[PDB]
Amino acid sequence: MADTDTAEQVIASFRILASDKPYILAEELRRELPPDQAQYCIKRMPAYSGPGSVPGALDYAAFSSALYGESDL
Amino acid sequence: GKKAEAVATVVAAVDQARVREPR
Secondary structure, eight states: OOOHHHHHHHHHHHHHHSSSOSSHHHHHHHSSOHHHHHHHHHEESOOOOSOOOOOOOOOOHHHHHHOOOOOOO | HHHHHHHHHHHHHHHHHTTTOOH
């Protein structure tokens, strides 16, 4: 809605699941995303990357770029 | 309705990368 660009859509969509957060927790994807989706994603998004992060945060923004862009080809 | 729509986008995007998974 307020954003659109394939990669931006996933970030805006993930932000909603993480509850207005620059990162998402593994447990959140398990209860917010099909158990199978949380496990697969929890692997893509590296270990978040913020200043006031938390003990167990993940960055879906890094994973979004890989889904629509992985290695040059 | 707003949150469910976001999950559809994340799930749809997740299935895209999964399609690249052999059997």
